[PDB]
Each structure stands twice: as structure tokens, then as C-alpha cells.
Enzyme design. Structure first.
Site, PDB file in Angstrom:
ATOM      1  N   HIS A 153     -10.817  -0.114   7.159  1.00  0.00           N
ATOM      2  CA  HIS A 153      -9.516  -0.699   7.584  1.00  0.00           C
ATOM      3  C   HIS A 153      -8.512  -0.700   6.418  1.00  0.00           C
ATOM      4  O   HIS A 153      -8.001  -1.760   6.069  1.00  0.00           O
ATOM      5  CB  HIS A 153      -9.737  -2.086   8.182  1.00  0.00           C
ATOM      6  CG  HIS A 153     -10.461  -2.050   9.478  1.00  0.00           C
ATOM      7  ND1 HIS A 153     -11.810  -2.327   9.591  1.00  0.00           N
ATOM      8  CD2 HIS A 153     -10.033  -1.737  10.716  1.00  0.00           C
ATOM      9  CE1 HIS A 153     -12.171  -2.205  10.850  1.00  0.00           C
ATOM     10  NE2 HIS A 153     -11.113  -1.857  11.554  1.00  0.00           N
ATOM     11  N   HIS A 205      -6.594   4.843   6.861  1.00  0.00           N
ATOM     12  CA  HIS A 205      -6.648   4.525   8.311  1.00  0.00           C
ATOM     13  C   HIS A 205      -5.216   4.380   8.842  1.00  0.00           C
ATOM     14  O   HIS A 205      -4.902   5.031   9.854  1.00  0.00           O
ATOM     15  CB  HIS A 205      -7.544   3.295   8.562  1.00  0.00           C
ATOM     16  CG  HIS A 205      -7.509   2.795   9.971  1.00  0.00           C
ATOM     17  ND1 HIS A 205      -7.930   3.557  11.040  1.00  0.00           N
ATOM     18  CD2 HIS A 205      -7.128   1.603  10.494  1.00  0.00           C
ATOM     19  CE1 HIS A 205      -7.799   2.859  12.154  1.00  0.00           C
ATOM     20  NE2 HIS A 205      -7.279   1.675  11.857  1.00  0.00           N
ATOM     21  N   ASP A 250      -2.833  -2.628  10.724  1.00  0.00           N
ATOM     22  CA  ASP A 250      -4.023  -3.331  10.158  1.00  0.00           C
ATOM     23  C   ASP A 250      -3.692  -3.984   8.811  1.00  0.00           C
ATOM     24  O   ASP A 250      -4.642  -4.243   8.032  1.00  0.00           O
ATOM     25  CB  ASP A 250      -5.215  -2.383  10.025  1.00  0.00           C
ATOM     26  CG  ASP A 250      -6.088  -2.301  11.265  1.00  0.00           C
ATOM     27  OD1 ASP A 250      -6.164  -3.310  12.025  1.00  0.00           O
ATOM     28  OD2 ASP A 250      -6.682  -1.226  11.473  1.00  0.00           O
TER      29      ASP A 250
HETATM   30  K     K Z   1      -9.566  -1.151  14.020  1.00  0.00           K
HETATM   31 MG    MG Z   2      -7.073  -3.783  13.885  1.00  0.00          MG
HETATM   32 ZN    ZN Z   3      -6.950   0.091  13.181  1.00  0.00          ZN
END
Ligand code: K
Ligand code: MG
Ligand code: ZN
Ligand code: JJR
Ligand code: CL
Ligand code: CL
Ligand code: CL
Length: 314
Positions: free
Chosen positions: A69, A73, A108
Site C-alpha cells: 500500500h 501502488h 491509499d
Molecule cells: K487496497
Molecule cells: Mg485502500
Molecule cells: Zn489501493
């Protein structure tokens, strides 16, 4: 004065248009790659280059050094959204192009490598603040914070009501990446497409379609070439097992995917995940947006590779 056009090397210029593009191991190229995608999917006048660059670097700084994360990503998810937009370019508004690439980059922000469940069982303060979609409401709050820094309002040319609309696109897109909400949203879109009731002029129907696009982008690591998908699966499992350890430290038995003692059952877990989540996801998205076919095709190829692992041929 916008005579400074962003360019990529020949291989990247061609391969960035393919859904299965991998952004590579050179972190210091990812900002340039994201700007290039913004200049081509949105336009070179969507954003002041100096504010976009300041925004990009503040976002990178607020992602953490976690196995999956992380900043890579964020850019990978944004690239999948780039590929969906360039291949369905008639279907989206100006504000949607602006908001969605930014939503994906920011989706994120400040992820610690733990699920909403661990934060509830740990009794983390964020669980008191946000009862549902805990991390996702936190990611959105982190986006607003960064936008509100001096010299970071990348939306400063928009009116009050347009600013308010794009922040509402970003908020709903980020919340939609909570996989607990995806099951209900995909079911509704399945029934809507099959009864011929789906209508892209209905804002509440746009909201659902963009939701599913966010899920598809967020999982797009299952849509890469086998070597990429296999290596990236080690990265997420590194996070799953670390959360499992933390569940055991609370005296709570972790669910199976998060137990590092159940390592040999990863191929069967992946089978479970592709059939219950991924295939349905890209199937429903291919029905609504037919040019997104190569995502489903590459998901099927990788499901087949997991079946070859379970038979001991890979
Ligand atoms: K995720
Ligand atoms: Mg997420
Ligand atoms: Zn994600
Ligand atoms: C019941 C189970 N669920 C899972 N969950 C998952 N397994 C694998 C991947 C993955 C990642 C990268 C490359 N290839 C596969 C993955 C990606 C995103 C998410 C969303 O939370 N979940 C994922 C494993 S067993
Ligand atoms: Cl860190
Ligand atoms: Cl922390
Ligand atoms: Cl400003």
C-alpha cells in the site's frame, strides 16, 4: 508558454497505452509518468505545472514505506484509470478526468499496512472517528489536508461550485475502494445492466460506474503479465502476514489469508479471490465499458496460471 510538453522514452511512450504496462523500478520517473498521463487524458491546461508538481511530491511524502500500500501502488492505480479513460474518452466530463487521476494517486494516502478490521479490534482512534470505511475516510481527509497547503490548490482556477463537485467525485471514488462496499455496488450494476435500466445521464448511476472503475484500478495488479502479478502477490501477502501476527498479539485468531503458517495455501487463496472478486469485477466492467476487455482477458490468464501452480506445473 505551455511549450514544455512532457515526453517519454520510445518503449514507455508505446507501452503506457497498454493496460498491462508496469511503471518500472525507477521511483524518480513516476512523477513525470503521472504528469504525462494528466497532460494526455485531461489536457496541458487542466493544471498549473508548478502546483501539480508541488502536490505530487507532498502526496508521495505522505505514503509510507510499506510492502504493498505504497507510492508505487498509487501510481499503478492511476495508470489503470488513465488506460480506461483513453479507451472510453467520449463517456466522461472535464471534471471527471481532473478528479479521477487525482483520486487514484491519493486513494491509499497514509496507509499503515492494516485493514479496517485490525483498526476496530485494536481500538485505534481512527475507528472512533470513522465507524465505517475507516482507512478510506482517513485517505480522503489526508487528500483535503494536502490540497489546503499553501501553493497546493491544483483546482484554484475552478469556481466554488466546480471545486465542490470535483472534491465530491474524489470523495466518492476514494470511499468506493473499500472492498466491503464493492460486493453491493457490483450486484446493483449487474441487475441494472441485465434489466436494461443502467443510465449514464443518472448521476447516482455514474457514481456506481466510477465506483466499479475504482475497484478495477485498485486490483489492476491481477491484470498484469504473470511475472508482475506473481511478484506483486508476495508484496500484499507480506502485509497480510504482518497483520496476522498483530491479530495473534491481540489473542485473536487471524482469518486464513493473514496467517503466515498457511503460506502453502496461497495458490488456493488466489483461486478463491479471482472467482469471488476479480473475475466478477472485470466481467461487470467489460459489460458496461467494452474497451476495458484486456483487463478481464489478463485476469483470466492469471487465474489459469494459479490453476497451473495448484497442479504443480508452475
Ligand atoms: K487496497
Ligand atoms: Mg485502500
Ligand atoms: Zn489501493
Ligand atoms: C480471500 C482472499 N483475499 C485475498 N486478497 C488479495 N489477494 C491478492 C491480491 C493481489 C495483489 C497483487 C497481485 N496479485 C494479487 C489482492 C489485491 C488487492 C486486494 C484488495 O484488498 N486483495 C488481494 C487473498 S485471499
Ligand atoms: Cl514510513
Ligand atoms: Cl503509525
Ligand atoms: Cl494556492
Amino acid at each position: 508558454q505551455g511549450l514544455m510538453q512532457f515526453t517519454l522514452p520510445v518503449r514507455l511512450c508505446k507501452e503506457i497505452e497498454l493496460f498491462h504496462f508496469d511503471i518500472g523500478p525507477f521511483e524518480n520517473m513516476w512523477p513525470g509518468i503521472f504528469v504525462y498521463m494528466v497532460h494526455r487524458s485531461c489536457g496541458t491546461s487542466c493544471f498549473e505545472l508548478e502546483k501539480l508538481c508541488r502536490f505530487i511530491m507532498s502526496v508521495k511524502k505522505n505514503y509510507r514505506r510499506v510492502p504493498y500500500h505504497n507510492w508505487k501502488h498509487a501510481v499503478t492505480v492511476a495508470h489503470c484509470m488513465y488506460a480506461i479513460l483513453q479507451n472510453n474518452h467520449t463517456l466522461f466530463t472535464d471534471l471527471e478526468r481532473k478528479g479521477l487521476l487525482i483520486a487514484c494517486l491519493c486513494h491509499d494516502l497514509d496507509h499503515r499496512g492494516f485493514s479496517n478490521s485490525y483498526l476496530q479490534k485494536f481500538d485505534h482512534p481512527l475507528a472512533a472517528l470513522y465507524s465505517t470505511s475507516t482507512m478510506e475516510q482517513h485517505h480522503f481527509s489526508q487528500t483535503v489536508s494536502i490540497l489546503q497547503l499553501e501553493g497546493h490548490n491544483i483546482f484554484s482556477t475552478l469556481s466554488s461550485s466546480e471545486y465542490e463537485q470535483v472534491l465530491e467525485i474524489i470523495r466518492k471514488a476514494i470511499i468506493a475502494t473499500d472492498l466491503a462496499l464493492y460486493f453491493g455496488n457490483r450486484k446493483q450494476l449487474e441487475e441494472m445492466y441485465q434489466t436494461g435500466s443502467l443510465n449514464l445521464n443518472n448521476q447516482s448511476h455514474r457514481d456506481r460506474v466510477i465506483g466499479l472503475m475504482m475497484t478495477a484500478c485498485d486490483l489492476c495488479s491481477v491484470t498484469k503479465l504473470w511475472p508482475v502479478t506473481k511478484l506483486t502477490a508476495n508484496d500484499i501477502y507480506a502485509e497480510f502476514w504482518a497483520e496476522g501476527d498483530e491479530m495473534k498479539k491481540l489473542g485473536i485468531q487471524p482469518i486464513p489469508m493473514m496467517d503466515r503458517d498457511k503460506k502453502d495455501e496461497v495458490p488456493q487463496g488466489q483461486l478463491g479471490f479471482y472467482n469471488a472478486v476479480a473475475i466478477p469485477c472485470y466481467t461487470t466492467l467489460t459489460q458496461i465499458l467494452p474497451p476495458t476487455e484486456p483487463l478481464l482477458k489478463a485476469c483470466r490468464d492469471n487465474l489459469s496460471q494459479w490453476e497451473k501452480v495448484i497442479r504443480g506445473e508452475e
